[PDB]
């Protein structure tokens, strides 16, 4: 069971007894790079011309 | 059937050039054909188009 | 901005007038297209070349 | 990658010779060294016929053995610690390494088996792209047509318009690699809007190609529309100084010069590969167009007018038209007694009829041929 929500401060305690959520991994906001990457993935879907600096955009 | 064919081929000939061809035995084909012809014409023409006009310059 | 644009309008106008001069006609001696459109032949047939082509 | 340039330079060495023993050859060899290539060295030597330094070959093969060893070993560690998306990647480095080692069958098989994995799209598609890439590299054909179909499906399903553009650049360049310029026209001509695929060549080269083929197979008003008025060309077509000069010379009725630049560029094509022996097909055609375009406004005109215009002697000009007239590729006909030329327009039917019959015959010959086979 992946149970993936937000603000771990919301989830109850009984769901945090150190052993019970095997690997707690956290997502980071998306910076220039990640965005840039994400930006390049989504912009790849549509028909994007040349002379297009995505970085400037992020 | 193949053997029969082979036999037929043998009877029709051997042959000299055919043997050589067989020995040689590729490549492609591209798409369509005709007519190749000679070559070295265009520039030759220009080489002359100059010369021509150069001759016509000489004219 | 609108001025230099007149060149466009002028062009579209000339093209039409011509198409209407040769509209109903054949072997129309070109000097006639000229005097009708009121312009020198040389650039008329200069254009009619462009249109044909 | 594999970097095409190796292939282009290779072809350059093949040339009518030309030997030389100049930039080219040592450029190649220089990229054998840093590429520890092999399958060439015997392939090339057997082709060009100039081998030497059996030592160098051994060194290259040795290092190759080292790395193929290494990647094999890496893969071995994965089998015990997979790593699905990982395994396939080490493979991509395997067959890819076959690309650096430029061995066809090997990267072929390697990639294939990686498709059984791949799973995603960039791996199952872009990898294919590379597989065909090899095709372009070797100068094959079918090997590509069957894979451009694959990628075609993969793109038709989902994907995006970013891969479709490279795709059209490949397909296009291919179309040029044959006599199929019409298909390359729209394909390439539309490739100017986007061109991220510098993998093959640069941008101004590509430009010259799309402008070349454009000039060749586009109509006069759509030449002016899509090329003479190319926002992406004006900035580039100013970067050049040859094809453009010819393109303009045509469009604007400045023939006589058009010819010279035509010959020039012709002498620049035989150097390329995409055309190879097409340098003879291109110019032939580019001769007709002008002759055509020159007459179209005349129901009669005199030779000396033409010859004068183009700046050649009559006799040679007559001699040229004689090539195109009998083939009904040109609607002229000549009167030498008076040195005059009159133009007989053609009928639409006359065009198709000649084309329809030709096409019908091609289908008939193929139908019957394989008919007998299936019949027996």
The closest alpha carbon to D215, from D262, D177, D170, D175, belongs to D262
Q: Which of residues 38-57 of B touch D (CB under 8 A)?
A: 39, 42-43, 45-46, 48-49, 52-53, 55-56
Touching status, chains D and C (3+ beta-carbon pairs under 8 Å): yes
Distance, first Cα to last Cα, chain C: 31
Residue A51 — left, alpha, or beta (φ > 0 → left; ψ -120 to 50 → alpha)? left
Per the DSSP assignment, residues forming a β-bridge with D302 are: D340
Asked if D84 and D54 touch (Cβ cutoff 8 Å), the reply is no
B51 SS3 class: helix
What's the gap in Å between the CA of D161 and the closest CA on chain A?
5
Q: Which residue has the tokens 């390494």?
A: D97
Asked if A30 and A38 touch (Cβ cutoff 8 Å), the reply is yes
Give the C-alpha separation, D316 to D281, whole Å. 20
Per the DSSP assignment, residues forming a β-bridge with D300 are: D342
What's the gap in Å between the CA of D364 and the closest CA on chain B?
16
Burial class (CB in 10 A: 0-12, 13-18, 19+), B31: exposed
Q: Is A49 on the interface with D (CB under 8 A)?
A: yes
Which residues from chain D sit within 8 angstroms of residue A43, using beta carbons?
A: 162
Asked if D170 and D129 touch (Cβ cutoff 8 Å), the reply is yes
Which of D141, D178, D280 is closest, CB to CB, to B39? D280
Tokens standing for residue D59: 């060194």
Name the residue in chain B with its Cα closest to that of D309.
B53
CA torsion sign for B16, B19, B21, B23 is negative
Tokens standing for residue D358: 């030709």
Give the C-alpha separation, D192 to D236, whole Å. 11
Distance, first Cα to last Cα, chain D: 48
- 3-state secondary structure string across chain D: CCCCHHHHHHHHHHCCCCCCCCHHHHHHHHHHHCCCCCHHHHHHHHHHCCCCCHHHHHHHHHHHHHHHHHHHHHHHHHHCCCCHHHHHHHHHHHHHHHHHCCCHHHHHHHHHHHHHHHCCCHHHHHHHHHHHHHHHHHCCCHHHHHHHHHHHHHHHHCCCCCHHHHHHHHHHHHHHHCCCCHHHHHHHHCCCCCCCCCCCCCHHHHHHHHHHHHHHHCCHHHHHHHHHCCHHHHHHHCCCCCHHHHHHHHHCCCHHHHHHHHHHHHHHHCCCCCCCCCHHHHHHHHHHHHHHHHHCCCCEEEHHHHHHHHCCCHHHHHHHHHHHHCCCCCCEEEECCCCEEEECCCCHHHHHHHHHHHHHHHHHHHHHHHHHHHHC
Give the count of Cβ contacts less than 8 A between chain B and D.
45
Give the C-alpha separation, D330 to D229, whole Å. 28
Which of A46, A49, A50 is closest, CB to CB, to D160? A46
The closest alpha carbon to D332, from D216, D259, D340, D314, belongs to D340
Per the CB < 8 Å rule, is B31 touching D180? yes
Burial class (CB in 10 A: 0-12, 13-18, 19+), D135: buried
Burial class (CB in 10 A: 0-12, 13-18, 19+), D80: exposed
Distance, first Cα to last Cα, chain A: 34
**Angle (nearest 5°) at CA C18 between C16 and C22:** 120
Per the CB < 8 Å rule, is A44 touching D163? yes
Residues 6+ apart with CB under 8 A from C47: C14, C15, C18
The closest alpha carbon to D177, from D217, D135, D130, D215, belongs to D135
Give the C-alpha separation, D164 to D168, whole Å. 6
Q: Which residue has the tokens 């840039």?
A: A36
Per the CB < 8 Å rule, is A49 touching D194? yes
Per the CB < 8 Å rule, is D161 touching A49? no
Q: Is C12 on the interface with D (CB under 8 A)?
A: no
Which residues from chain D sit within 8 angstroms of residue B56, using beta carbons?
A: 311, 313
Give the C-alpha separation, D150 to D175, whole Å. 18
Q: Is C53 on the interface with D (CB under 8 A)?
A: yes
Give the C-alpha separation, D166 to D147, whole Å. 14
Per the DSSP assignment, residues forming a β-bridge with D178 are: none
Give the C-alpha separation, B37 to D283, whole Å. 14
Which residues from chain A sit within 8 angstroms of residue D165, using beta carbons?
A: 47
Phi, psi of D209 (to 5 degrees): -65, -55
Q: Is A44 on the interface with D (CB under 8 A)?
A: yes
CA torsion sign for D285, D291, D295, D300 is negative
Q: Is D253 on the interface with C (CB under 8 A)?
A: yes
Per the CB < 8 Å rule, is B45 touching D180? no
Substitution target from D280, D306, D308, D323 for chain B, most B beta carbons within 10 A? D280
Q: Is D193 on the interface with A (CB under 8 A)?
A: yes
Give the C-alpha separation, D270 to D279, whole Å. 6
Tokens standing for residue D255: 């023939």
The method recorded for this entry reads: cryo-EM
Residue C25 — left, alpha, or beta (φ > 0 → left; ψ -120 to 50 → alpha)? left
Tokens standing for residue D319: 């001699």
Spacing of C-alpha D34 from chain mean position: 28
Q: Which residue has the tokens 């899509």?
A: D226
Spacing of C-alpha D293 from chain mean position: 27
Give the C-alpha separation, D98 to D369, whole Å. 41
Chains that touch C (3 or more CB pairs under 8 A): D
Q: Is C49 on the interface with D (CB under 8 A)?
A: yes
Integer-rounded Cα Rg, in Å, for chain D is 26
Asked if C18 and C33 touch (Cβ cutoff 8 Å), the reply is yes
Give the C-alpha separation, D173 to D167, whole Å. 10
Residues 6+ apart with CB under 8 A from D258: D246, D249, D250, D290
Give the C-alpha separation, D60 to D93, whole Å. 18
Which of B42, B43, B52 is closest, CB to CB, to D312? B52
Substitution target from A44, A46, A53 for chain D, most D beta carbons within 10 A? A44
Give the C-alpha separation, D206 to C9, whole Å. 37
Asked if B43 and D256 touch (Cβ cutoff 8 Å), the reply is no
B47 SS3 class: helix
Give the C-alpha separation, A13 to A15, whole Å. 5
Give the C-alpha separation, D43 to D105, whole Å. 14
What's the gap in Å between the CA of A13 and the closest CA on chain D?
34
Angle between helices D84-100 and D127-138 (to 10 degrees): 10
Give the C-alpha separation, D13 to C48, whole Å. 51
Query: Between the CA of residue D116 and those of C9, D85, D91, D110, what are the distances in Å?
Result: 63, 12, 12, 10
Tokens standing for residue D50: 């100039």
Q: Which of residues 212-271 of D touch A (CB under 8 A)?
A: 232
Which of D162, D195, D232 is closest, CB to CB, to A44? D162
Tokens standing for residue C41: 């032949």
**Contacts of D93-101 spanning 24+ positions with Cβ under 8 A:** D94/D68, D96/D130, D97/D67, D97/D68, D97/D71, D99/D1, D99/D2, D99/D130, D99/D133, D99/D134, D100/D1, D100/D2, D100/D35, D100/D37, D101/D36, D101/D37, D101/D38, D101/D39, D101/D64, D101/D68
């Amino acid at each position: 069971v992946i149970m993936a929500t937000n603000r771990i401060d919301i989830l109850d305690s009984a769901l945090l007894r150190p052993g019970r959520i095997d690997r707690k991994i956290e997502f980071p906001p998306p910076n220039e790079e990640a965005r840039l990457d994400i930006l390049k993935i989504h912009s790849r879907k549509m028909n994007l011309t040349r002379g297009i600096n995505l970085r400037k955009i992020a | 059937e193949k053997k029969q064919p082979v036999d037929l081929g043998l009877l029709e000939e051997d042959d000299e050039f055919e043997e050589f061809p067989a020995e040689d035995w590729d490549a492609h084909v591209w798409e369509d054909n005709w007519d190749d012809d000679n070559v070295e014409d265009d520039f030759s023409n220009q080489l002359r188009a100059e010369l021509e006009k150069h001759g016509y310059k000489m004219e | 901005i609108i001025s230099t644009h007149l060149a466009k309008l002028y062009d579209n106008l000339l093209e039409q007038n011509l198409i209407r001069v040769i509209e109903p006609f054949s072997r129309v001696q070109i000097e006639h297209i000229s005097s009708l459109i009121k312009l020198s032949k040389a650039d008329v047939e200069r254009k009619l070349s462009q249109m044909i082509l | 990658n594999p970097d095409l340039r190796i292939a282009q330079l290779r072809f350059l060495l093949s040339l009518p010779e030309h030997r030389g023993d100049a930039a080219v050859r040592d450029e190649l060899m220089a990229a054998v060294r840093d590429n520890n290539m092999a399958p060439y060295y015997e392939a090339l030597c057997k082709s060009l016929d100039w081998q030497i330094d059996v030592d160098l070959l051994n060194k290259m093969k040795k290092a190759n053995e080292d790395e193929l060893k290494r990647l094999d070993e890496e893969l071995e560690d994965a089998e015990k610690n997979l790593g699905e998306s990982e395994i396939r990647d080490a493979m991509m480095a395997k067959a890819e390494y076959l690309c650096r080692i430029g061995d066809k069958e090997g990267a072929l098989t390697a990639f294939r088996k990686t498709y059984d994995k791949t799973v995603a799209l960039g791996h199952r598609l872009d990898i294919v792209f590379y597989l065909l890439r090899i095709g372009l590299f070797y100068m094959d054909n079918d090997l590509i047509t069957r894979n451009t179909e694959k990628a075609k499906s993969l793109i038709e399903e989902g994907g995006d318009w970013d891969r479709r553009n490279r795709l059209k650049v490949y397909q296009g360049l291919y179309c040029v690699a044959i006599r199929d310029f019409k298909q390359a026209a729209e394909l390439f001509l539309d490739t100017v809007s986007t061109f991220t695929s510098y993998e093959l060549m640069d941008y101004k080269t590509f430009v010259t190609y799309t402008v070349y083929v454009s000039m060749i197979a586009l109509e006069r008003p759509d030449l002016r529309e899509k090329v003479i008025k190319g926002a992406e060309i004006l900035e580039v077509l100013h970067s050049l100084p040859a094809v453009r000069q010819y393109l303009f010379s045509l469009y604007e009725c400045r023939y006589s010069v058009f010819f010279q630049s035509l010959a020039v560029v012709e002498q620049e094509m035989k150097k390329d590969w995409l055309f190879a022996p097409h340098y003879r097909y291109y110019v032939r055609e580019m001769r007709i167009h002008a002759y055509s375009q020159l007459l179209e406004s005349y129901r009669s005109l005199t030779l000396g007018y033409m010859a004068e215009a183009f700046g050649v002697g009559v006799e040679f000009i007559d001699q040229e038209l004689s090539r195109f007239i009998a083939a009904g590729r040109l609607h002229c006909k000549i009167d030498k007694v008076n040195e005059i030329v009159e133009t007989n327009r053609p009928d639409s039917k006359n065009w198709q009829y000649q084309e329809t019959i030709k096409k019908g015959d091609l289908l008939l010959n193929r139908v019957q041929k394989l008919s007998r086979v299936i019949n027996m």
